[PDB]
Backbone:
C-alpha cells in the first residue's frame, strides 16, 4: 500500500528487498519505465520498515574509486594525476583477482598512495596493503591467511609480511524461507 | 642551470607573441628568470646544488679520467625547447585565436588597419591569460625540472 | 613563499590595470575612425594615428599624478616586505 | 490459529513453551531469530499474550535481580540447553550458603522464570575455571600474561601481534565466554607497538632481569 | 491534518517520519510529484511535533565532503586542490569498506589533512586517523576494536597504533510497533 | 515469474544462471532485442534468489585492464603512460599462454610496475610476478608449480624463484543435473 | 532448444562447439547473416552446457599482441614505441617458424622486453626467451627439447643455453565419435 | 552437408582440405561467389572435423614479415626503421635462394636484428643466423648441413660456423589415395 | 558544534607554524551520565589533526530542556 522508496536503480532495489526480507517484512518491486523502480510494503510493516531504512542507511550510495576524481578528459595531466589513476586500477584488478580463489565470495583491497615523494629529492617510501574477504562457511579460515599473504606479497615492488594485513570472515546464515503475510 | 633556461625561453615566446621583439627580424623574460631564481632558492636550492657538487667527487674524482658521457648530451637542446613550448602552450593558442578573429573582422570591412589594431590588444591579453595560471602552475614546474644528485651516473662515466 | 606569490600576482595585475585605460582609449578611436571609413570610402591607412596621438597623450595627461601614487604605494610596500 | 504455525516454514529454529502465569514463551536461539519472532508478535497476528525469550538476554535479566536481592554472590552462568530445567553454575570455594539456604535460592529463581519447572543448582571449582583458560591460551601459542588476585584472574595480551594471532585469539575468547562467562576470568586483548609482545627486561652488570608487569611500555625502534 | 514540513524529498522525509514514530506520534507522507513530498500530523500531535522538529533540527542537511569544495571541472588545479581531492576519496572508500565487516551497520573515517609541509623544505608529518562505528547488539564490542586498528594501520604510509582512535557503540533498541491514532 | 534483473547483456546473464542453478533454483533467460536480456525466477524461489544476488554481488562487472586508464588515442603520451600500456599487454599475453598448458582451465598473472623510474634517473628495481590457476581435477597439482615457475622465470629481464609466487587449485564439483520445478 | 550464446563469429563458434562435444552434449551452429552465429543445445543438455561455459570462460577473447598498443599511423613515434613493434614482430615470426618442424602442432614464444636500458648509459641486459609447444603423441618428447634450443640460441645477439626455457607437452586424446541425442 | 568454415582465402582453403584429407575425412570446396570459399564436411565426419580444426588451429593466419610494420610510405624514417627494412628483405631473399638447392622443398631463415647499437656507445655485435629446411626423402641429410653453412657463411660481413644453426628434416609420407565417403 | 583555530598565514614567513586548537559544544539526551562522555569527544577529536594536546581541546556540553507536550490552550474573552 504505502511507498517508502521510489526512483531507485536496479542494483539499489535488490539490496532494499534483501534487507527487508531478512527482518520478516515482505516488500514489492514495481517498475515504472524510465522513472526507475519503486518499493512498497503493507500496513502493519511500515513502522518497522522506516526503522530499518534509517538504521541500514538505505538506499546505498554508488561505490567510489580514486580514478573517478582524476578524469582522463583533461588535456593537462599532472604526475599526481597519473599515478593516482595508475594505483586505482591495480587495486581494482587485485580485487577482481581475489574473487577467483577457492571459497572467496567477496574481497576488498587497499594500497598506500604515494604521490609527493618523487617531486623532491626524497626517496620513495615502502608500500603497504590491506585486504578483506568473505569466505564460504565450512572453511578453515585460519590457514587461508597465508595464501592471500603469499599472493599479495610479490605482486608489488618490495613489501614485507608485516605490511600486509588481511582480515576475513565467514558468511552469515542463509535466508531461504518466505517472510509471511500480515493477517489481520 | 637546466630549470632557468626553460623559464627564460618561456618569457621569450610570451614576449614575442605580443610584439616588442620584431625590431630585430628582453624585459619580460628577465622577470620570469628572476622569479624562478627565488622560488628555487627558498625551498632547498643551495642544499641540492652543493649536494650535486659533493656527489660529483664520489663518482668522478680526478686522476681517474671522468668524461661527460656523449650519448645523452645530444638530446639536451631538444629537452629545453620541448619544456618551454608545452609550458607556454596556452598564451600562444589564445593569441592565435585573437588573430584569426581579427583577420575575420577585416573581411567584412578592409579599411580598418587591422595589423595595428591587434598590436594594441595582444599585450593585454598576454598578461590577462598568464594571470590565471601564474600562481598555481609555475612554481611547481621549477621544482619539477630541478636536477638532483641521483642522476649523476647517467651523465658522467670514468675511463679507467 | 606566500608573499613571493602575492608580489608576483600584483606586479602583473598593476601592469594589466595601468596599461588598461590608454589601451582602451586608443581602441575605440581606432575602431570608430575606421567605421567612418566604412561609410565614406577612404583608402588612407595612416589616418587614425592623428587621433591616436591625441588620445594617448590626453589620457596620460589627466591621470599623470594618479600613476605616481600607485607606483609609490606599491614600491614602498615591497621594500618593507623585503627588509622586515 | 496456533502460534507455532504463524512463524516460519521450518518449526525447527523456534520453540514454544507454556507459561505458568498464562503466557506463551517463544524460545529463540540468537539475535537474528529474535527479531524474526518479535516482528510477528509486534505486528499483532496473534490474539493472546506471548513473549520472546533468549539465552543471552534472560541471563542478563536475572542478573539485575540477583545483585539486588543476593549481593556478594559468587556465580558464573545459567545454561539453557534444556529450557524447562536450567542449570545454575555456582562457585564452590567462595560461598557460605548451607543446604537450607540453597533451597530458598532454588525456589526464588524458579519464581522469576514461569516457563521453567525446577532450577538445578550445581557447584563448580574455581581452579578448573582458570586452568582451562590457561591451557587453552597456551595451546594456540599466544603471548600472554596472567595476573592472579583475590576474587578473579585476568589475562593480558599486548604487543604488535600479526594477523593470525588476532584471529586465533578472538576465536578462542568468544568460545570460552559462551561456556563460562566473564565473571571470574577476563581477557584483555589490546594492540600497541612493541615487538617484545608483553615482556620487558632491564640490563645491568650481570645479565638481564625480568621486570614486573607494568602499564608503561618501551616504544620499539626496528 | 496540519502540515509542518513541505517541499522535502525522499531521503529527508524518511528521517522525519522515523524520528516522529519513535516518540509515539503518527505522520503521513503525501507525495506531490514535481514539488516533492510533504508531511502532516494530527492536531493533538502538532504541539509535540513542532518541539521535536526544533530539538532534532530537522530536515537534515546533505552530508558534506571535502571534494565538493575542490571540483574537478575547474580549468586549473593547484597541488593543494589535488591532494585534498585524493584524500577525500580515500576517506570515502575506507568508510565504504568498513561497512562490509561482520556486524558493522555504519562507520565514519577521518584522515589528517596536510598543507604547509608540502611546499617548503620541512618534511611531512605523521598521519592520524579517527573512526566511528555502530555495531549490532549482542556483540562483545571491546574485542572488535583491534580488527579495525589492524585494518586501518597499513592502508597508509607510516602510522602508529597510538595515532588511531576508534569509538564504537551498539545500536539502539528496535522500534517495531505502531504509534497509535489519537482518539478524542 | 518475478523479475530479478533486466537489461543484462549476454555474458552477464550466463553467469547469473550458472550461479542460481547451483542452489536448486532455475531461471529463464528472456531476450528483449535492444533492451538486453532479462532473468526471471518463481515465487518460492524469489526469496532465495534475491539472497544469492546480494551475497555473490551479481551481476558481474566487466574486468579491468591497466591499458584502459591510459588510452592510445591521446595526443602526447608520457613515459609513465607508455610502460603502463606495455606491461598491461604483457600480463594479458602471459595469461593467454598459460591456458595452453595441459590441465589448466583459467589463469591470472600480475606484474610489478615501475612508477618513479619513469621520471627519475634512479636504476629500476627487480620485477616481481604472481600467478593464479585452476587445474582440471585428478591432476598432480603439486608438481605443476615447477613448470609455471620455470616458464615465468626467463620471460623477463632477471627474476629469481623467491620473487615468483604461484597459487593454484583444482576445480569445483560438476553440476550436471537439472534443479527441479517448485511443486506445491 | 534454449540458446546459450548468439552474435559470435566464426572462430568463436568452432571453439564453443569443440568444447561442448568433448563432454557428451550436442550443439547446433545457426547462421544469422551479418549478426554472426548462434549456438543452441537441448534442454537436458542446458544445465551442463552453462556450467562448462562458465568454467572454460567461453566465448574466447581475441589474442593480444604487443604491436596493437602502438599503432603505426601515429604522427610521432618514440624510440620506446618502435622497439616494441620490432620485438613484437620477431616474437610472432619465430612462433610461425616453429610450426614447420617435425611433429609440432602449436607453439608460443616470449621475448624479454627491455626499453628503459636504451636511453641511459647503462649497458644493455642479456635477452631471455621462453617457449611452449604441443607435439603429436607417439614422439620422444625429451629429445626434441635440444633442437628447439639449438634453433632459438642464435636467432638473437647473445643468449646462453640456460636463459631459454622450453615447456612442451603432447596433445590430448582424439574425440572422433558423435555425442548422441538424448533418448526420451 | 553441414558447413564448417566460410569467408576464407584461396590458400586458406587449400590448407584446410589438405589437413582434413590426411585424417580420412572428405571436404567440399564450395564457392560462395563474392564471399569466398567454404568447406562443408559430411554429418558423420563433423565431430572429427571440428576436433582437427581446433587442434591444428585452422584457418591459417597470413604469414608476417618484419618490414610490414615499418612501411616506406611515411615522409620521415628513422635509421632504426631503415635497418629493419633492409634486414627483412635480406632474410626473404636468402629464403628464396635456399629453395633452389638440390632437394629442398621449403626453408626459413632468421637473422639477428640490431636495435640499440645505433645510439648506444657500444659497437654493433656479430650477426647470428638460423635456418630450417625440409628435404626430399632418400637424401643423406647429415651431409647437407655442410652445404648450407658454407653458403650462409660469407653472405654477410663476418659470421662464424658457431653462430649458424641449421635444423633440417626429411618430408612426411605421401598422401595419394582418396579418403572415402561414409557408408550411410 | 565544532570550531577550529584559523591560522593560515604561517606559510608567509620562515617561522614554523603554530599548533591547532579545537572547541566543541554538544547537547545530550536527558538521563545520560554526561560527565564520563567528555573523554570520548576528546579522544575522537584528538587525532583528527596533526598534533594537538589534551588541553588544547575544550568540550562544553549540556543536557536538553524539559519536553513540551501539552497543548497551549484557547483563550476566553
Residues:
Amino acid at each position: 500500500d504505502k511507498d517508502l522508496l521510489k526512483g531507485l536503480d536496479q542494483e539499489q532495489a535488490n539490496e532494499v528487498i534483501a534487507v527487508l526480507q531478512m527482518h520478516n517484512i515482505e516488500a514489492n518491486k514495481i517498475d515504472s519505465g524510465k522513472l526507475g523502480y519503486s518499493i512498497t510494503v503493507a500496513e502493519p510493516d511500515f513502522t518497522a520498515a522506516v526503522y530499518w531504512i534509517k538504521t541500514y542507511q538505505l538506499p546505498p550510495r554508488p561505490r567510489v574509486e580514486i580514478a573517478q576524481m582524476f578524469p582522463a578528459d583533461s588535456l593537462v595531466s599532472s604526475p599526481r594525476a597519473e599515478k593516482a589513476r595508475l594505483y586505482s586500477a591495480i587495486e581494482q584488478r587485485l580485487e577482481q583477482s581475489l574473487q577467483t580463489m577457492e571459497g572467496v565470495l567477496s574481497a576488498r583491497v587497499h594500497i598506500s598512495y604515494d604521490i609527493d615523494a618523487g617531486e623532491n629529492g626524497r626517496p620513495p617510501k615502502p608500500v603497504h596493503l590491506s585486504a578483506l574477504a568473505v569466505y564460504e562457511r565450512g572453511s578453515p579460515l585460519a590457514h587461508q591467511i597465508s595464501d592471500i599473504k603469499r599472493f599479495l606479497k610479490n605482486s608489488f615492488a618490495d613489501v614485507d609480511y608485516d605490511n600486509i594485513s588481511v582480515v576475513l570472515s565467514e558468511r552469515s546464515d542463509a535466508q531461504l524461507q518466505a517472510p509471511g503475510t500480515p493477517v489481520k | 642551470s637546466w630549470p632557468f633556461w626553460v623559464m627564460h625561453a618561456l618569457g621569450c615566446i610570451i614576449d614575442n607573441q605580443r610584439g616588442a621583439t620584431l625590431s630585430s627580424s628582453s624585459e619580460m623574460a628577465n622577470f620570469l628568470n628572476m622569479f624562478a631564481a627565488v622560488v628555487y632558492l627558498q625551498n632547498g636550492g643551495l642544499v641540492t646544488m652543493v649536494d650535486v657538487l659533493n656527489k660529483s667527487y664520489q663518482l668522478c674524482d680526478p686522476m681517474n679520467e671522468c668524461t661527460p658521457s656523449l650519448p645523452p648530451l645530444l638530446t639536451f637542446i631538444n629537452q629545453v625547447a620541448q619544456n618551454a613550448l608545452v609550458l607556454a602552450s596556452p598564451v600562444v593558442l589564445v593569441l592565435l585565436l585573437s588573430e584569426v578573429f581579427l583577420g575575420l573582422l577585416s573581411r567584412f570591412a578592409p579599411q580598418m588597419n587591422a595589423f595595428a589594431i591587434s598590436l594594441t590588444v595582444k599585450s593585454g591579453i598576454a598578461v590577462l591569460i598568464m594571470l590565471l595560471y601564474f600562481s598555481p602552475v609555475l612554481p611547481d614546474n621549477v621544482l619539477r625540472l630541478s636536477f638532483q644528485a641521483t642522476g649523476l651516473s647517467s651523465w658522467f662515466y670514468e675511463r679507467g | 613563499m606566500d608573499d613571493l606569490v602575492f608580489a608576483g600576482n600584483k606586479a602583473l595585475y598593476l601592469v594589466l590595470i595601468l596599461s588598461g585605460w590608454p589601451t582602451i582609449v586608443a581602441t575605440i578611436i581606432g575602431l570608430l575612425v575606421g567605421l567612418f571609413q566604412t561609410v565614406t570610402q577612404l583608402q588612407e591607412q595612416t589616418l587614425p594615428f592623428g587621433i591616436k596621438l591625441l588620445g594617448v597623450c590626453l589620457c596620460l595627461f589627466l591621470l599623470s599624478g594618479w600613476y605616481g601614487e600607485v607606483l609609490l604605494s606599491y614600491g614602498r610596500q615591497v621594500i618593507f616586505l623585503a627588509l622586515a | 490459529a496456533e502460534l507455532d504455525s504463524l512463524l516460519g516454514q521450518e518449526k525447527e529454529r523456534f520453540q514454544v513453551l507454556p507459561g505458568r502465569d498464562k503466557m506463551l514463551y517463544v524460545a529463540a536461539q540468537n539475535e537474528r531469530d529474535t527479531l524474526w519472532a518479535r516482528q510477528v508478535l509486534a505486528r499483532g497476528d496473534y490474539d493472546k499474550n506471548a513473549r520472546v525469550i533468549n539465552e543471552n538476554e534472560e541471563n542478563k535479566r536475572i542478573s539485575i535481580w540477583l545483585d539486588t536481592y543476593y549481593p556478594q554472590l559468587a556465580y558464573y552462568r545459567i545454561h539453557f540447553d534444556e529450557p524447562r530445567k536450567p542449570v545454575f553454575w555456582l562457585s564452590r570455594q567462595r560461598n557460605t550458603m548451607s543446604k537450607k539456604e540453597l533451597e530458598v535460592l532454588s525456589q526464588k529463581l524458579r519464581a522469576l522464570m514461569p516457563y521453567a519447572d525446577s532450577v538445578n543448582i550445581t557447584l563448580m571449582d574455581d581452579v578448573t575455571a582458570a586452568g582451562q583458560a590457561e591451557a587453552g591460551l597456551k595451546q594456540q601459542a599466544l603471548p600472554y600474561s596472567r595476573r592472579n588476585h583475590k576474587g578473579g584472574v585476568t589475562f593480558v595480551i599486548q604487543g604488535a601481534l600479526d594477523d593470525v594471532e588476532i584471529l586465533r585469539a578472538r576465536q578462542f575468547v568468544d568460545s570460552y565466554y559462551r561456556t563460562w562467562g566473564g565473571r571470574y576470568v577476563q581477557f584483555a586483548i589490546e594492540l600497541k607497538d612493541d615487538w617484545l609482545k608483553g615482556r620487558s627486561f632491564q640490563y645491568g652488570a650481570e645479565g638481564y632481569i625480568k621486570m614486573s608487569p607494568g602499564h608503561w611500555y618501551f616504544p620499539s625502534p626496528l
